[PDB]
Amino acid sequence: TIDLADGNYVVSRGDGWILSRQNQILGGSVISNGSTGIVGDLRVNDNAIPYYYPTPSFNEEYIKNNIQTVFANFTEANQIPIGFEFSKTAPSNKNLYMYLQYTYIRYEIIKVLQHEIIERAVLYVPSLGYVKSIEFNPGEKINKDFYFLTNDKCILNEQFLYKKILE
Amino acid sequence: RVLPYSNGLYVINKGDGYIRTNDKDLIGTLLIEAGSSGSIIQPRLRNTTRPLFTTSNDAKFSQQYTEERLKDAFNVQLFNTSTSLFKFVEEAPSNKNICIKAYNTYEKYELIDYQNGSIVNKAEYYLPSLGYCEVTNAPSPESEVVKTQVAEDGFIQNGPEEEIVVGVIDPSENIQEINTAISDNYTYNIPGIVNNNPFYILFTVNTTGIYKINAQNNLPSLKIYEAIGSGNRNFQSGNLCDDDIKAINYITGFDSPNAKSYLVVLLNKDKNYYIRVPQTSSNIENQIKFKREEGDLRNLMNSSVNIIDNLNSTGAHYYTRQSPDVHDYISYEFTIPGNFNNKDTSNIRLYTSYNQGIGTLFRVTETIDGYNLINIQQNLNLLNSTKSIRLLNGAIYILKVEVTELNNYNIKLHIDITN
Amino acid sequence: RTFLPNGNYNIKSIFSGSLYLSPVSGSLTFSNESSANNQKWNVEYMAENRCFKISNVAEPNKYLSYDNFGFISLDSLSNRCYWFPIKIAVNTYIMLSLNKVNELDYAWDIYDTNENILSQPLLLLPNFDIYNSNQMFKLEK
Q1: CB-CB contact of B300 with B359 (8 Å)
Q2: Any transmembrane segments, and where (chain A) (predicted)?
Q3: Which of B342, B343, B368 sits opposite C84 (nearest CB)?
Q4: CB–CB of B83 and A35 under 8 A?
């Protein structure tokens, strides 16, 4: 129940979103005893793919057009490659595991009626990445929460940046 | 060790950092003179990478398929091409040389047909990962050489211990969907096109609560599954949205053919659920009734209520069913042989042979609104229970069993009646 | 469905099979099976009041009801002719009047000298729980 005038709004939640079940897809490297690991990535037109969750009334096109008019235009931008990498050094006693996960911006577009949200379509367009380190002795049981994101989330704080879709 | 799992397809992530024996996977060792530093880089000048795959059945569990199941389970994008890159770097101390060696690695996925107590099919998919590196003191080059025999082909895990399982929609079972969110009641007709095969029903609900779901005449027996991570992302009030999720989590339900059952489950508005109607067999038309239960029946929450119509006037009876896991529930609605005097009684001991449980006993009264459970006995300890109770002939009761210790895949319930 | 499906039922006391609900000199009493339409009750869920009405098949414009003396009655249709059944075992029910008397429910009840009801009129009397034998009646087919 959100305090806005009846109508359609375009909305940016954060950079820094990450998706259910998708930790570990890219693989992960394991490094031991105070050597250093550096995993990183690029961006042709795989990383580049955005994920659309449309609704009746908010078709893919509608979404794309409408958020590219307000915010970061992505189709244009993710043609030029950009890189990112992380550099984790291990302690000397034990060894550690680090794996790469792609971060996304969460755009969504919302129908409001009666200070209430009746409908929401969502677009995740890929930003950069994020790595998670963990130190382990072999046999040491690990928290399932570490390897499995069970519900989408932002690893940064969210936000709610909005614009009314015009008539 | 019991590993109850409501039979079907499961893909597991058995962990990262796997390598093959005999350095089939070593990139190479390089040796760092004290006070220098040295790295080994996988730059991805060329994308292509090789996964490794082995299966019990090519015909069923083909690499293409067992790849698709990883898409289903973890939405894995790429299988033999990574643009993601890795390097290992090390500095040697000034006293002694150091030497760093690097192995390519794999995440190890397992794909499983787990039908009815045992894995009837299994594939192992080794997905190319992002490295393992060992740093050691430089070995003395004069050190003597041990004639040493190579090892059996196989694998070593260097990543931390991991095993995380994910249920997946069986691509051979169709999906049918209910576009309208279920509200308070709803009756669903099994369409033509399912042709009495198994299939899935995707649906959602509007306001969150407890629902009784049965088929026509509580037959066939159903299972319900939550879809993992549903209902963040898109939503349209009143209807469902596809979300794009075929990774599923078993809530409750039997796999047994021709057992009579109804499900009683909690359902949350911000999630999507699949139901799995099994092979119909029958040529008559069937239906799935969803009712929202606001009454006493919430007591059976996240249980499948098993139906026993068939008691003999006296004697031993038993009812073997897939056991739920520790701290989940199986329930049992039974009506006791004999006409209802309201003074007549039959003596009823309720044992269980293999697993322990907390049994909860109710008398059932039914009104036009719904069941009413009157509370008869609590805290009953079932495992080989000496105990008995006098129940009323012709009256109808429900036993709700919480599994406490899980000692066997099936839970066998006895109703041994005396007079 | 499943629960009291519309149709043609017999109506007994749990105190004796071999006796059926029948109207006689304008009272309702349990009597010897006559295999006739006098003893067959047509019971009809009326979804508008979530309750059931029960007509006598041989005089099917007359429904089961009650008067301002204690008795259950056969009468032309009235809000009194509405009943809210509670099933408490295969085929047995405790018929409550939908509309409550003061703050408490009433039910079909029938007196027994010793589990014997032979000449007894069916009356409407306060209900409390599901444990009153006399309040219990069974409806078959």
Answers
A1: no
A2: none
A3: B368
A4: no
Structure tokens at B129: 């990962």
CA distance B292 to B20: 54
Q: What's the sign of the alpha-carbon dihedral A145, A149, A155, A159? A: negative
Cα B378 to Cα A15, B334, B359, B375: the distances in Å are: 53, 17, 7, 8
SS3 B352: strand
DSSP C14: T
- Yes or no: say if A148 and B165 are a contact pair by the CB < 8 Å rule: no
β-pairing verdict for B223-227 and B273-277: antiparallel
Ordered structural domains, chain C, with CATH:
1-141 (2.80.10.50)
Judging contacts by C-beta atoms under 8 Å, the chain B residues touching residue A56 are 236, 239
Residue C48 DSSP SS3: coil
C-alpha closest to that of A101 among A35, A12, A39: A39
Which uninterrupted H or E stretch holds C56?
A: strand C51-56
What CA–CA distances, in Å, run from B61 to B116, B147, B169, B171, C34?
Answer: 18, 41, 14, 12, 70
Distance CA B254, CA C86 (A): 31
H or E stretch at A65: helix A60-68
Please state, as a whole number, how many other Cβ atoms lie within 10 Å of the Cβ of residue C101.
12
Phi, psi torsion values for C59, nearest 5 degrees = -130, 60
Residue-range domains of chain B with CATH:
1-139 (2.170.15.20), 158-309 (no CATH), 310-419 (2.60.120.1090)
Distances (CA, A) of A36 to A32, A90, B23, B282, C59: 8, 6, 21, 64, 96
Residue C139, phi then psi, degrees to nearest 5: -120, 120
- Domains of chain A, each with CATH number or no CATH: 1-167 (2.170.15.20)
- Greatest CA span in chain C, whole angstroms? 40
SS3 C104: coil
Q: Which of B212, B334, B342 to mutate to test the interface with C (most CBs of C within 10 A)?
A: B342
Contacts of C84 in chain B (CB under 8 A): 367-368
Cβ contact, residue pair A28, B84, below 8 Å: no
Contacts of B203 (CB under 8 A, 6+ apart): B177, B178, B181, B182, B240, B272, B273, B275, B290
Resolution in A for the shown PDB structure?
Answer: 3.5
10 Å Cβ neighbour count for A69? Answer: 12
Q: Which of B341, B368, B395 sits opposite C88 (nearest CB)?
A: B395
In eight-state DSSP terms, residue A71 is S
C-alpha distances in Å from residue B33, one per residue of B93, B95, B353: 9, 10, 68
